[PDB]
Amino acid sequence: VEKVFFVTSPIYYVNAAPHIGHVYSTLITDVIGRYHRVKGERVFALTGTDEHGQKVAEAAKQKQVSPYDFTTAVAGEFKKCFEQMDYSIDYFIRTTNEQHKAVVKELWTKLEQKGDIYLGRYEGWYSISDESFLTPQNITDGVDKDGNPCKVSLESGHVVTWVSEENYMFRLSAFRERLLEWYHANPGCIVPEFRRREVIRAVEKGLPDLSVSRARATLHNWAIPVPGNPDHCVYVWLDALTNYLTGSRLRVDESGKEVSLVDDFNELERFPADVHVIGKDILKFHAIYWPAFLLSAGLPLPKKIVAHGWWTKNVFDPVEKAEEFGYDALKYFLLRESGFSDDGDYSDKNMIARLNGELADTLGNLVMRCTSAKINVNGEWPSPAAYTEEDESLIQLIKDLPGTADHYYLIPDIQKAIIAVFDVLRAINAYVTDMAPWKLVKTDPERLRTVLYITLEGVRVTTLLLSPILPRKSVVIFDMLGVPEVHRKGIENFEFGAVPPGTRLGPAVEGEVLFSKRSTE
Numbered sequence: 001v002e003k004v005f006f007v008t009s010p011i012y013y014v015n016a017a018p019h020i021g022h023v024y025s026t027l028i029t030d031v032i033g034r035y036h037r038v039k040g041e042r043v044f045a046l047t048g049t050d051e052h053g054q055k056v057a058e059a060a061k062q063k064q065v066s067p068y069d070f071t072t073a074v075a076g077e078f079k080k081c082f083e084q085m086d087y088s089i090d091y092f093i094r095t096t097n098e099q100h101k102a103v104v105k106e107l108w109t110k111l112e113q114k115g116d117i118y119l120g121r122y123e124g125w126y127s128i129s130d131e132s133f134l135t136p137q138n139i140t141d142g143v144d145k146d147g148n149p150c151k152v153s154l155e156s157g158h159v160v161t162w163v164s165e166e167n168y169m170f171r172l173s174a175f176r177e178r179l180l181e182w183y184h185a186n187p188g189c190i191v192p193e194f195r196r197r198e199v200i201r202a203v204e205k206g207l208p209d210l211s212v213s214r215a216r217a218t219l220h221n222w223a224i225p226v227p228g229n230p231d232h233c234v235y236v237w238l239d240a241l242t243n244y245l246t247g248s249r250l251r252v253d254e255s256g257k258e259v260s261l262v263d264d265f266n267e268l269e270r271f272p273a274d275v276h277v278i279g280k281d282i283l284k285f286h287a288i289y290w291p292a293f294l295l296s297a298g299l300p301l302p303k304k305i306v307a308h309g310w311w312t313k314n315v316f317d318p319v320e321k322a323e324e325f326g327y328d329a330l331k332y333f334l335l336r337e338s339g340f341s342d343d344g345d346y347s348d349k350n351m352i353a354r355l356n357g358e359l360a361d362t363l364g365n366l367v368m369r370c371t372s373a374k375i376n377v378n379g380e381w382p383s384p385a386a387y388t389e390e391d392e393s394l395i396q397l398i399k400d401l402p403g404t405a406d407h408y409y410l411i412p413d414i415q416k417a418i419i420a421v422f423d424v425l426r427a428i429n430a431y432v433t434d435m436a437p438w439k440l441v442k443t444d445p446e447r448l449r450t451v452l453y454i455t456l457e458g459v460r461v462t463t464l465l466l467s468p469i470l471p472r473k474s475v476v477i478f479d480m481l482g483v484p485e486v487h488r489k490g491i492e493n494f495e496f497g498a499v500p501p502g503t504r505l506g507p508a509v510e511g512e513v514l515f516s517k518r519s520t521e
């Protein structure tokens with residue numbers, strides 16, 4: 001089916017300021033989005049804030065301001081951060097939004113009508129900071145900010161409290177079999193695989209019913225009322241997970257403000273998400289609860305959930321570090337340095353290593369070589385002569401790259417996609433050192449044409465597939481290479497030889513550097 005490619009970040013709690021956790025999650029969302037736009041598809045990327053809850057109100061209480069003021073402000077801080085980071089997210093959703101609340105009421109009522117919601121009790125442990133229900137096996141001893149003998153979550157380490165409330169309960173136990181079918185039938189639906197195996201083991205152990213309402217007093221009334229029972233409020237997580245459904249039904253205008261909420265999700269061709277980007281901290285909510293709610297309501301399940309190494313909830317300010325090293329450079333580092341186990345190194349020493357070693361020396365260097373007036377004497381893409389077997393060996397790599405990178409982007413594994421491109425860049429540099437085109441201006445012009453054309457085309461294709469990672473620098477590179485706008489996106493232009501010979505380069509700046517190297521501290 002030809003739909004809108006729907007990619008989402010998680011919606012972040014507004015109890016605190018934007019930090020790297022959120023910037024990272026939304027960066028992954030943004031890159032996936034951009035890739036599918038470069039591929040020439042329709043894209044809706046969603047991000048936003050998660051504004052109801054005991055945890056938010058109790059943080060608004062701390063600053064001694066009303067919940068409406070505190071959330072609006074922090075939401076603003078989030079919006080500004082994402083504009084500074086230079087994402088291309090299509091909409092910013094807020095759970096305080098009135099359209100969103102309508103959708104939550106719709107969904108709640110649908111679940112009630114199915115007989116999947118009932119009035120019961122929850123008597124157990126709860127982490128206010130995680131907004132998570134925990135069994136006694138998931139808790140152990142620890143300390144509070146006041147350093148007293150309290151209990152804490154094994155998951156997160158935040159403080160837990162015992163809760164004994166009469167709650168509206170969701171019949172999650174009844175969705176154990178159908179969830180297991182979904183996992184085993186769609187083995188790519190949770191990524192990476194070891195997290196898929198985690199979710200499956202957990203559901204096989206057994207599922208308790210899930211409390212989906214709280215008594216309004218406990219939430220400091222900062223929540224959505226349960227339809228037809230204002231004594232209770234809706235669990236922040238059913239509220240929160242529903243943002244994806246809300247998002248898929250909002251018409252948005254030129255400026256990014258929402259204007260209309262359609263009745264039927266099919267009208268906009270967005271639901272369900274093709275990728276949900278999340279941190280490992282919130283895997284169970286997205287891989288167990290969410291599909292069960294959607295199963296209950298007769299809605300379609302998402303295609304992929306990708307859970308990364310960081311935690312979604314010693315200073316490291318992204319906006320500071322981007323101002324010091326470059327914006328695209330930082331994004332490159334975060335996407336290249338870590339896969340899906342979180343153990344990677346985020347020191348300056350390392351970023352500089354990757355900035356100099358890879359962005360400057362591999363990519364940047366190569367861009368300057370194939371454009372410089374010394375080597376490229378006519379300032380154009382020359383017409384190639386006949387190809388050696390060494391020429392063919394490089395061309396073959398260039399031709400294979402798009403398919404390879406495409407499979408990686410689709411997993412999705414953005415680290416592996418980058419690596420695949422840089423493998424081809426390293427190869428092109430090797431070909432250039434070997435060919436030595438700087439010598440060939442004097443001795444052999446017929447040959448230089450061939451060498452230079454291949455270089456240029458390798459640089460174009462590598463740059464095209466890197467454009468979701470380095471969106472600004474890719475534009476600068478293409479300008480230098482003189483690539484017409486039409487050839488900068490679309491699967492058509494993944495093919496070798498898309499730009500014809502005789503294409504003129506962009507004008508040069510006598511002092512232009514693509515990536516400037518920085519000192520080993």
Ligand code: MET
Pocket residue numbers: 010011012013050240241242282312313
């Ligand atoms: C439905 S995504 C909710 C995520 C949660 N608000 C967090 O910040 O981790």
